[PDB]
Amino acid sequence: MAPKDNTWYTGAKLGWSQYHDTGLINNNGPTHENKLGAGAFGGYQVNPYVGFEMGYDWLGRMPYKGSVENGAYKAQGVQLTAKLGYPITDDLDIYTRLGGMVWRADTYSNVYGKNHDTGVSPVFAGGVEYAITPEIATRLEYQWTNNIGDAHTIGTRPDNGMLSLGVSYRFG
Ligand SMILES: CCCCCCCCOCCOCCOCCOCCO
């Protein structure tokens, strides 16, 4: 049950990412990592199979071990994607999103202070959308970015996936 033919929708999501990066010195510094965040998205449906959406997401590193040492991590990004779906039932859609994202990571260190980073990256998602009612739908989605990137020195990697639950309102 995708949104009706030339209509708009909006929504919000809560996300979790199990590690969107990772650090190290021989010698270990943190123990493992968790990021939690949220995001908002809006889109336009063209027909039952295709829509286009815009979203903004934010992720924050969650505080959890000591052993001296580390600090704050925040990521944010605006994305523009084409959403391709197929109706499995009258209520359940399966879809993928493909497009691009402009992001920014802001770090912090006690030694080094504040640092930032910027990027442009392809984004991909696979998910399920369930129409509770004709105006309210929930989504279960896994989003990933594959990373290649221009820079430094020479590129290697690790951005990882984000899992999320969302709700959206359809202005039919
Ligand atoms: C993958 C890149 C994103 C490309 C998608 C952009 C899609 C843009 O078009 C969306 C449709 O928006 C058009 C509506 O405006 C019509 C208003 O009413 C007309 C006067 O009565």
Q: How many CB atoms are closer than 10 A to CB 137? A: 23
DSSP label at 20? S
At which residue do the structure tokens 């009612």 appear?
133
Q: For residue 69, how many other CB atoms are within 10 A of its CB? A: 10
From 47, 52, 54, 120, the mutation candidate for ligand 1 (largest count of ligand atoms within 8 A of CB) is 52
Total domains in the fold of the chain: 1
Can you give the CATH number for the domain in which 129 is found?
2.40.160.20
Q: Pick the residue whose CA is nearest to atom 6 on ligand 1.
A: 52
Asked if 17 and 163 touch (Cβ cutoff 8 Å), the reply is: yes
Range of the domain at 83: 1-172
99 lines ligand 1 (CB under 6 A): yes
Distance CA 154, CA 172 (A): 49
Residue 82, ligand 1, Cβ within 6 A: yes
Neighbours of 143 (CB within 10 A): 23
